[PDB]
Amino acid sequence: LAMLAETSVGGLRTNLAFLRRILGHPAFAAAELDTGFIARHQDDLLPAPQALPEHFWQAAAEAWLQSEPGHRRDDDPHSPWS
Amino acid sequence: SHMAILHTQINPRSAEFAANAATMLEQVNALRTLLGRIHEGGGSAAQARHSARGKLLVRERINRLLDPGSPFLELSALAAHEVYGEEVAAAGIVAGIGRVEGVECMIVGNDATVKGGTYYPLTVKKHLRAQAIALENRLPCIYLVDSGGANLPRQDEVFPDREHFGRIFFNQANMSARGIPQIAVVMGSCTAGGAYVPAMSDETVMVREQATIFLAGPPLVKAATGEVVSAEELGGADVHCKVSGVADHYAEDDDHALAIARRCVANLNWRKQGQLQCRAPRAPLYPAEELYGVIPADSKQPYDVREVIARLVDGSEFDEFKALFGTTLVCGFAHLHGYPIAILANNGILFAEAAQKGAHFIELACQRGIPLLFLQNITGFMVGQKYEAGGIAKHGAKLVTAVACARVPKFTVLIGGSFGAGNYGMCGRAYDPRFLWMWPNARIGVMGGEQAAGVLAQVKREQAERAGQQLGVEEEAKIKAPILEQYEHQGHPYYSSARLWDDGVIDPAQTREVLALALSAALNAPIEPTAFGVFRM
Amino acid sequence: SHMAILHTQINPRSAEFAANAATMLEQVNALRTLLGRIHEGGGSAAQARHSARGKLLVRERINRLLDPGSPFLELSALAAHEVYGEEVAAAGIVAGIGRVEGVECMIVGNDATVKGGTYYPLTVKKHLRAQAIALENRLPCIYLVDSGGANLPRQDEVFPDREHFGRIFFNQANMSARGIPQIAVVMGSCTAGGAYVPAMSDETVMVREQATIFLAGPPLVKAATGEVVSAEELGGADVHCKVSGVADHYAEDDDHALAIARRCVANLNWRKQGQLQCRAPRAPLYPAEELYGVIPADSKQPYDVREVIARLVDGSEFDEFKALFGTTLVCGFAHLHGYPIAILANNGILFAEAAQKGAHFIELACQRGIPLLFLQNITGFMVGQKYEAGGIAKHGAKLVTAVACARVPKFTVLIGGSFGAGNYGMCGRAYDPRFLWMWPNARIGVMGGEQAAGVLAQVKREQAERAGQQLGVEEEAKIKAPILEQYEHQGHPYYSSARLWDDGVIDPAQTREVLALALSAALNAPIEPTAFGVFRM
Numbered sequence A: 001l002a003m004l005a006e007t008s009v010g011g012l013r014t015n016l017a018f019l020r021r022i023l024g025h026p027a028f029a030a031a032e033l034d035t036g037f038i039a040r041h042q043d044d045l046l047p048a049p050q051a052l053p054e055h056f057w058q059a060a061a062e063a064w065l066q067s068e069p070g071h072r073r074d075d076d077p078h079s080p081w082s
Numbered sequence B, C: 001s002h003m004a005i006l007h008t009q010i011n012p013r014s015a016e017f018a019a020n021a022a023t024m025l026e027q028v029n030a031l032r033t034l035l036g037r038i039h040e041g042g043g044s045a046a047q048a049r050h051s052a053r054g055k056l057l058v059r060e061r062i063n064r065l066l067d068p069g070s071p072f073l074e075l076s077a078l079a080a081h082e083v084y085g086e087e088v089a090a091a092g093i094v095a096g097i098g099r100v101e102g103v104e105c106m107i108v109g110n111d112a113t114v115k116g117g118t119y120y121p122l123t124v125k126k127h128l129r130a131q132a133i134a135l136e137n138r139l140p141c142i143y144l145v146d147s148g149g150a151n152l153p154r155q156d157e158v159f160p161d162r163e164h165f166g167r168i169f170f171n172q173a174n175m176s177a178r179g180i181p182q183i184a185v186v187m188g189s190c191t192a193g194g195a196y197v198p199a200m201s202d203e204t205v206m207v208r209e210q211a212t213i214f215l216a217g218p219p220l221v222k223a224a225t226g227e228v229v230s231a232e233e234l235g236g237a238d239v240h241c242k243v244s245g246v247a248d249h250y251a252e253d254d255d256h257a258l259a260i261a262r263r264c265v266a267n268l269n270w271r272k273q274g275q276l277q278c279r280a281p282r283a284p285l286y287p288a289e290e291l292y293g294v295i296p297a298d299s300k301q302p303y304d305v306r307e308v309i310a311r312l313v314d315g316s317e318f319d320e321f322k323a324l325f326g327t328t329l330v331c332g333f334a335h336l337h338g339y340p341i342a343i344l345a346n347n348g349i350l351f352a353e354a355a356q357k358g359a360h361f362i363e364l365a366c367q368r369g370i371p372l373l374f375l376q377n378i379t380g381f382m383v384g385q386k387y388e389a390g391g392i393a394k395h396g397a398k399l400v401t402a403v404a405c406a407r408v409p410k411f412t413v414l415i416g417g418s419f420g421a422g423n424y425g426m427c428g429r430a431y432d433p434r435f436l437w438m439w440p441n442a443r444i445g446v447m448g449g450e451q452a453a454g455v456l457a458q459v460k461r462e463q464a465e466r467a468g469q470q471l472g473v474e475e476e477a478k479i480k481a482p483i484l485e486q487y488e489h490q491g492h493p494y495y496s497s498a499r500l501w502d503d504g505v506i507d508p509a510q511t512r513e514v515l516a517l518a519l520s521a522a523l524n525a526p527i528e529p530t531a532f533g534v535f536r537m
Ligand SMILES: CC(C)(COP(=O)(O)OP(=O)(O)OC[C@H]1O[C@@H](n2cnc3c(N)ncnc32)[C@H](O)[C@@H]1OP(=O)(O)O)[C@@H](O)C(=O)NCCC(=O)NCCS
Pocket: B115, B116, B117, B118, B147, B148, B149, B150, B151, B152, B153, B189, B191, B192, B193, B194, B217, B219, B220
């Protein structure tokens, strides 16, 4: 589960999300194993979407801003305008 | 260089410090909140009736045009404060410098919300003050045109004269000739006057179904040989992009129009011509916040300037010239965010040796091409009978010559008092410093409140004395009352920034970072060699 | 800048596409194959006879001289093609720009195999045209002299006039004065005329027992006061390196000579003068060969040039000026291999609008110091009674002044038709573009085939009409026949490039590759400020 959280794939539809929670579902803790399992807790592992909090938007905005250094002019690098 | 350090003598925990720092911070909060009121433009009222037409607001247009998170130095925000009868928010024109495609640019846009965006006398003054900073520092211009016309009732102070409207066009065609791009973004009405801002411009952009550039709008045009035509048909967006050629780019809306704009600044092949031996930036050694408490609250209470110096320079390293001589004026070399600078800061009165000290400094500075930084807190020149017989007159002159002629970049900031001859000998407004700023605590005037009421009333009883009478404490006191209050009123920052005597009131603990922004910006223009006039020895 | 992108509308798969692509590509192989024949020189025949004397061949001397795998821009390869009676490959001299010790150099060498390497008129025309590119762009000069003399039979077009032989020396003394070194390598006969190329050159090198520089060789000198002596005795390599001092370097053979050469180009303390704000080089968004199919095969079937631009600019990003105004002329900014450039491509006719659009654009490129690229495919200026009474006359002139005066590097490629006024307003040969190229499908003439035949035949029946008669389709048709063909002939790329009206015919699909080469080389020399004449408003 450790590995699944340190892994990151972007720019495509991935099941990386699904797995993370199927190793974490309490059913998987106990031997509640059979071949219907994936069907059973179907809800628990394929939740319905939602444009989650501003909580997000905020960070995503601050993160985006921090990953474009602006521009550094050869003219005066130290320029505080960057 | 562990010798060029300024070890502080201020205790940040003292009670006296907390006292000053107190009423200082209040002052700043005072400004803070006003500046917010001014952000409202013509008030939620029509400001919302703006967005109505699907038009982006002024300051919004600016943030969209700027570079992702670029800083923005705003100019004379307190413009026209309590000046005109009505409220004319930042004089109905917001201007400032900001990064646009990696270029420090001068931006000006009108607040359509403020009394129809028309030009009141000061709107014009602010506009022109911007083109100055622009020509003086070679910053390409971006005019976000959205104005009515010129404020019809006060035209006498808005149309004729030299530095009146129309001098906007003058500076413009001259800037395009001295090779400083002139970009125009039309996002509203633009009848008559401002009709030239986009007509006279290297590159021009129009927002369809919204932009309108015509000499005489339908009101005027109907008032002509009759004829009744609509805005869109007379001089709309489609008329000047597809027909006449007064515009160059056909933008679909405010957001598009600015995007088009960015692009122009992008194909500028622009390169900075300034040139200094800037060194790596190293922060000061004392929180620049601590300034709040270094500055006494008791206006005419003695403090050591080097303290303010130590909280702005790099690594608070400062090498002092003529260390112990006419100490009334402190002079030294240091660096600020890399950029090396030569400083001249008042520390009291100003005897003869202080100006010879300062004039001699300005020669060394102007000889190495290092920017000049003036920190005013001058009450005046020491007067007296021996003092006058000593040339405190001609030596003072020596200083001003040096200042008036210095051609390297000059920067002034008022942190105390601009009073009398002092203001001039320290690069006051009239000596064209690239930028002039004012602290909340500083006050400016020809001479003290009662000082002027002193003389002004003295003569009244000198002319009435050799006229066989005398001034009774009843009339004399009524002579000084009106003065003592007038002076107190026009000595205040708001009154000053309101009339553009300075490019704005700033946060004392932000100074350091304003100077860096400025200095860098002024390096878009070559540091020219200096030629001094005759020195009265 | 995902909006400054040009989205094609070309289907590389379409039938129509491969149709054009077909005839285009055929034309390129037509050129590919003739180009090879001209690499023959004086033919396998004497060519082998050359190598026999132990002399490296011309085009090989060049390959050896250049830097490991450096590129090489050859000039007017079709020189003198089907021009003089005989066949004179590349006019007996190959020249072009190539790297030598990290410096973009102008290299000129003669083909001792083509009619003795002597100078036919076009030889002088081409040699001269190189020193022009040398001067105009400040590229040092390497002359690989190995020629007989001047082609005696056709001297009346090789010796007298301003731009004839001897102007060769002029140009050399002048460039030497303007500090563009002049280097010479004597690897053959060097009688009389070409005798000065080696004597007038900062540095000179001679191949022993092979090179000979004498004002009058043994033929002439015996025809003098009798006297009979050998070539190497008269003016060999040992005579001029050990005794006279007309040479500076004593080389062992062709290969050594070239080695000594390079070494001179090494201690040139050379620095480039140009200066643009070039950015990182990004490739286009569409295969450059797609062009073969962008260009109609139907001579006068309209197409959109923006499709052509899209395949040369970096990341097919193009910022278009006066986007929708005088659409017949396309203008915009973008870059090519990093270097910023301003484009002016024809998209049809050229009504007043276009001209104004263009003049105005040039003004902007000229003010920002950005090089201009012209893309000709102009059929002419729209004629008529209104169009004429509308000043399509004077408007067109505003365009020419602009072009004529622009002092920024200018580049011209003929990708359509240069016919009439058009050729001029679009920076034709007569306007000093640093370089001017021609695609194989391009046709250049004073005006169309029957166009001329039209007027030229019509006056004949106007002089003969007010002469009490008329011209029956009998003589009328015989007055048109000759002209119709003459023009078809004098309009083809070979006909042009053989006379140097262009620095060559190139591969449409390589245009970008050559444009960047040129530009770079043109930056060995400063971009000057521009001064405009009077503009007829
Ligand atoms: C500019 C104009 C299109 C305004 O359009 P709008 O967005 O509908 O704005 P409004 O008409 O509601 O104008 C509202 C304010 O504009 C002010 N105003 C507009 N033009 C003005 C002018 N030239 N002088 C003085 N005030 C003017 C009005 O006083 C009004 O004030 P108020 O809000 O306190 O009542 C319209 O006023 C106009 O056509 N003016 C022409 C100006 C002109 O011809 N000037 C030539 C001199 S250079």
